[PDB]
Amino acid sequence: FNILLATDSYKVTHYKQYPPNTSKVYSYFECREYEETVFYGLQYILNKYLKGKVVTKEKIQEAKDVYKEHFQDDVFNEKGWNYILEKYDGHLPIEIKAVPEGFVIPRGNVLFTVENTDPECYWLTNWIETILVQSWYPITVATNSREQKKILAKYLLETSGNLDGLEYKLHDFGYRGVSSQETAGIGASAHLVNFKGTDTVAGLALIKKYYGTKDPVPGYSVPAAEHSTITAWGKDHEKDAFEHIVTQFSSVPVSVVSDSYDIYNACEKIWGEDLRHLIVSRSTQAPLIIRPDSGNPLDTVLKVLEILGKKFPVTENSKGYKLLPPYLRVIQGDGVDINTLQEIVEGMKQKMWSIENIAFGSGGGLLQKLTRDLLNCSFKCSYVVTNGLGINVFKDPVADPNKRSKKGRLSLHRTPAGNFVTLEEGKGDLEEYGQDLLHTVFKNGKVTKSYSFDEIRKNAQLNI
Amino acid sequence: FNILLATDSYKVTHYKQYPPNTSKVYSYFECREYEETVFYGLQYILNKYLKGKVVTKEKIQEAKDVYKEHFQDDVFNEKGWNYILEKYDGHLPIEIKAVPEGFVIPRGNVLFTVENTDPECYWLTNWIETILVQSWYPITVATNSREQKKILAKYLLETSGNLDGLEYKLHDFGYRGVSSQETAGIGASAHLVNFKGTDTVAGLALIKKYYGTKDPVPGYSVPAAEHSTITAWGKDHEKDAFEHIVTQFSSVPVSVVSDSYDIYNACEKIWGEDLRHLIVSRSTQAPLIIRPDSGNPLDTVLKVLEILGKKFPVTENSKGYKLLPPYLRVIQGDGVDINTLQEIVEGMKQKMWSIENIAFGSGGGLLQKLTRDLLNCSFKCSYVVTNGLGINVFKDPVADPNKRSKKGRLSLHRTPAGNFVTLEEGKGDLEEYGQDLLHTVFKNGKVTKSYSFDEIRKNAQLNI
Ligand SMILES: O=C(NC[C@@H]1CCOC1)c1ccc(NC(=O)N2Cc3ccccc3C2)cc1
Numbered sequence: 019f020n021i022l023l024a025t026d027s028y029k030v031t032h033y034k035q036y037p038p039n040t041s042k043v044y045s046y047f048e049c050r051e052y053e054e055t056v057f058y059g060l061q062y063i064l065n066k067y068l069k070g071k072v073v074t075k076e077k078i079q080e081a082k083d084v085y086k087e088h089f090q091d092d093v094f095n096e097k098g099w100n101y102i103l104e105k106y107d108g109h110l111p112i113e114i115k116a117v118p119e120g121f122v123i124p125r126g127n128v129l130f131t132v133e134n135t136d137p138e139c140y141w142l143t144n145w146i147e148t149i150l151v152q153s154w155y156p157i158t159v160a161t162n163s164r165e166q167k168k169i170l171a172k173y174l175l176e177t178s179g180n181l182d183g184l185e186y187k188l189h190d191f192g193y194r195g196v197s198s199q200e201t202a203g204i205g206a207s208a209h210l211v212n213f214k215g216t217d218t219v220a221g222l223a224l225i226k227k228y229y230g231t232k233d234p235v236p237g238y239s240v241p242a243a244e245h246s247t248i249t250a251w252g253k254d255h256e257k258d259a260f261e262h263i264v265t266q267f268s269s270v271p272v273s274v275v276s277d278s279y280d281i282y283n284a285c286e287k288i289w290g291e292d293l294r295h296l297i298v299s300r301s302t303q304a305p306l307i308i309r310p311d312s313g314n315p316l317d318t319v320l321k322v323l324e325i326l327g328k329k330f331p332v333t334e335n336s337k338g339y340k341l342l343p344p345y346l347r348v349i350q351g352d353g354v355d356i357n358t359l360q361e362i363v364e365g366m367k368q369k370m371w372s373i374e375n376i377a378f379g380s381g382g383g384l385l386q387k388l389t390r391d392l393l394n395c396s397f398k399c400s401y402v403v404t405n406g407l408g409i410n411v412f413k414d415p416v417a418d419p420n421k422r423s424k425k426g427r428l429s430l431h432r433t434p435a436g437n438f439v440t441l442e443e444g445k446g447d448l449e450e451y452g453q454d455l456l457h458t459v460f461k462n463g464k465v466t467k468s469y470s471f472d473e474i475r476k477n478a479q480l481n482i
Numbered sequence: 483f484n485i486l487l488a489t490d491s492y493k494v495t496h497y498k499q500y501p502p503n504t505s506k507v508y509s510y511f512e513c514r515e516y517e518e519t520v521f522y523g524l525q526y527i528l529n530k531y532l533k534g535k536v537v538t539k540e541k542i543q544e545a546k547d548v549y550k551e552h553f554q555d556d557v558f559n560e561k562g563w564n565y566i567l568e569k570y571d572g573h574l575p576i577e578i579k580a581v582p583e584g585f586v587i588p589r590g591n592v593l594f595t596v597e598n599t600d601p602e603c604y605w606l607t608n609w610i611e612t613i614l615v616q617s618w619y620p621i622t623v624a625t626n627s628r629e630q631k632k633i634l635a636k637y638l639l640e641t642s643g644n645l646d647g648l649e650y651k652l653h654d655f656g657y658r659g660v661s662s663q664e665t666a667g668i669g670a671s672a673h674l675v676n677f678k679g680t681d682t683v684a685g686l687a688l689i690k691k692y693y694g695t696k697d698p699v700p701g702y703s704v705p706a707a708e709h710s711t712i713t714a715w716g717k718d719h720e721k722d723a724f725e726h727i728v729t730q731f732s733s734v735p736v737s738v739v740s741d742s743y744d745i746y747n748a749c750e751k752i753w754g755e756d757l758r759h760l761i762v763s764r765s766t767q768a769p770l771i772i773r774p775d776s777g778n779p780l781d782t783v784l785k786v787l788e789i790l791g792k793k794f795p796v797t798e799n800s801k802g803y804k805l806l807p808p809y810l811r812v813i814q815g816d817g818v819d820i821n822t823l824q825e826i827v828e829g830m831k832q833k834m835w836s837i838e839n840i841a842f843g844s845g846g847g848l849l850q851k852l853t854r855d856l857l858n859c860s861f862k863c864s865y866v867v868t869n870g871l872g873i874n875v876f877k878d879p880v881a882d883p884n885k886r887s888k889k890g891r892l893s894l895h896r897t898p899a900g901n902f903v904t905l906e907e908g909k910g911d912l913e914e915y916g917q918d919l920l921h922t923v924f925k926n927g928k929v930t931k932s933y934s935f936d937e938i939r940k941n942a943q944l945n946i
Pocket residue numbers: 186187189190191192215217239240241242243271273274307309347348349351377379490491492
């Protein structure tokens with residue numbers, strides 16, 4: 019990795035564009051005015067990409083050669099980068115202040131600030147905008163995952179009277195549906211801030227190395243079938259495939275994809291009649307989890323439940339909702355996103371089915387179908403010192419008031435009613451509010467403050 | 483990187499689910515049913531993750547320890563992975579056949595096939611589905627980028643009499659808007675299959691290391707301003723910022739963001755009057771590129787052009803379309819995706835503005851706002867050998883005929899009219915359609931066929 023080649027190309031030319039005699043460039047990140055966001059992911063970026071000796075004579079030469087060809091011109095700040103290598107042994111003269119990870123903050127508040135600690139390195143603040151702005155991704159995954167936990171919590175509490183098994187009800191199926199191995203690890207770790215069920219194993223190594231848990235692992239899985247594992251038996255032997263799989267995993271929960279040919283036939287005739295004897299004997303700690311994987315997600319879930327309810331002994335819980343026997347559950351793992359999860363739980367509640375009957379598997383909807391536009395994650399310069407005088411800077415485009423940026427030095431505070439407020443123009447210096455919630459997390463090539471994954475989970479908890 | 487921890491968790495349990503005495507699992511990839519797709523990205527995955535010694539005693543132990551805790555059970559195939567380490571010095575006994583990279587293939591055709599070359603490793607074919615299915619991302623970026631090139635080519639040919647500068651008209655601004663550094667390099671490289679303009683620096687190193695070009699670099703950029711380099715001068719000094727930037731880059735093209743406060747005032751009064759003398763003197767090889775970055779993308783482009791048309795000497799080209807002087811161009815870099823690019827070029831053509839006047843910058847729309855569902859990229863088992871007998875395997879869900887998979891051994895052929903056909907059930911063995919278009923690209927830990935980035939570009943060319 020070469021930090022000199024890890025920026026938007028045009029940033030290579032910005033050192034020549036700032037006002038002459040600029041000694042400070044101060045910038046901030048916010049999710050411009052999903053009412054609240056989970057702040058998560060910065061610690062990973064700081065350790066993997068920004069800390070320690072990030073500049074070497076070889077990295078400077080490599081960048082110089084690439085940029086000469088890329089711009090067809092010598093525009094690269096070799097002097098500037100050589101200064102960092104010589105004065106600081108290649109350590110970044112930058113200070114980053116951030117809200118603690120796992121913190122749940124309303125939209126439109128400062129989440130982190132960046133500034134150079136050496137006047138010569140005024141250009142460095144925004145050089146690293148590209149790498150830091152990528153924090154949008156774990157923030158958005160964590161936020162969108164927490165918003166789904168709120169929906170699940172609400173419906174589980176309404177239909178069952180409690181939150182038992184809430185943290186296993188949204189399972190990450192997104193490993194293949196994501197853009198890269200690195201995204202897989204980041205995205206899966208962000209979902210684990212809220213839940214404990216994952217098949218995206220890449221998330222486990224990321225948490226272990228960069229955050230850490232008291233428990234051996236942050237997430238769990240159960241054996242489950244795939245279409246290859248069912249269809250390999252041949253179309254006439256679906257019942258043999260099912261019998262073999264449930265017999266191999268007789269003492270643990272086992273998920274079995276049942277839509278290879280006809281989901282409704284598999285539920286009614288195969289599980290409900292032919293193999294019913296192998297299901298009703300299962301332990302409560304080892305249910306069969308039937309998995310449909312096609313069709314309209316709500317219509318399929320409802321039809322599968324109506325079939326199962328007629329083949330298996332259903333009870334009515336204390337809330338008046340229908341509950342399958344404990345050795346039998348359902349998992350909807352196709353086309354689940356925040357909108358369809360809401361339609362399913364609401365449709366189940368309308369048909370008097372408890373949310374304890376189901377779990378959801380989400381792939382692309384959980385880790386890939388998200389953009390930087392969803393929470394309007396943006397990094398902008400708000401303060402500069404030129405000719406020794408500090409000036410409050412901002413953008414305010416005439417056609418879009420939503421793109422107006424904050425002015426001056428910023429601080430994040432608790433209001434008297436316990437909400438959040440971002441003070442602008444260095445007004446945090448007046449001791450009118452409590453202490454600034456932004457803490458130094460990075461300074462001069464060193465990570466100064468770290469959070470464990472356990473602290474992050476605690477910070478990200480739902481109120482209920 | 484540990485390939486034993488680079489799969490969906492449930493795949494760890496599949497070796498116990500296949501019919502006993504299975505010696506072969508044969509699977510394929512397709513973009514089920516954007517009528518045609520650019521096949522690109524497999525070579526990167528083969529080299530970075532699949533080739534050479536991918537199994538060690540340490541990797542086996544690491545995976546064993548993680549899975550023991552992750553499943554709260556021992557289900558990990560330690561014996562199977564030890565067999566690969568001992569028999570093949572940790573090299574994967576797998577054969578992968580693929581269509582040449584850069585090839586443009588209609589939807590619903592076999593793109594690549596995977597099979598084990600050792601009977602003991604029947605479970606390996608689908609273990610690596612997760613890593614290979616991630617090919618969806620460079621395929622979709624390359625395809626969506628090529629679809630945008632088709633729109634640009636059509637309107638540029640209609641409004642001017644040619645395609646001059648086509649490969650510089652869609653510039654990648656997506657570095658900050660992607661989910662990770664790895665995604666940035668993959669995605670930017672896929673856009674470079676069709677275009678030559680990029681700010682996502684990460685793409686260059688990927689192409690150099692994994693594909694290669696005759697030219698020193700596959701993509702180019704020009705100096706450009708950002709809001710921080712304009713706004714740092716203070717709200718009353720936007721003219722001073724502009725004058726300094728264009729004087730610093732007087733002999734190369736320079737992009738200048740002009741919407742910090744009022745885009746229309748900046749075009750009419752600042753560029754159009756105050757600084758007009760510094761613009762009209764610029765070389766044809768060094769235009770000023772005005773950059774709006776807010777408001778309705780089409781309305782803003784049209785109003786900016788109407789303003790410039792009244793302040794600068796506009797000509798009428800041979801097709802009857804309006805053309806700015808050669809020292810002046812526009813770049814629309816906000817909210818550009820395939821839909822808005824289409825609306826802008828059509829809106830410009832309706833107002834008699836040539837497409838030579840504009841270039842587009844696309845961030846999230848080009849590299850992030852894409853999912854595996856867009857081209858229905860899917861990997862499925864189509865053939866197995868059990869007890870020495872080959873059987874044609876497929877899924878055919880009752881509620882979704884679109885999810886029905888192909889049967890048996892597959893081959894890709896040219897039809898008599900020069901189109902494509904995927905033959906199923908080993909029918910390629912009949913010499914009725916000539917030779918199979920898939921080639922062995924990987925066999926037993928080695929990459930057996932590779933393509934340069936220049937061959938890929940040639941294969942991906944538009945007919946026009
Ligand atoms: O219900 C479940 N959990 C809640 C509780 C926990 C203890 O049991 C109840 C459950 C858990 C996992 C699964 N996994 C699968 O179905 N996969 C995994 C995966 C990955 C990628 C693609 C496809 C698939 C199919 C299913 C149900």
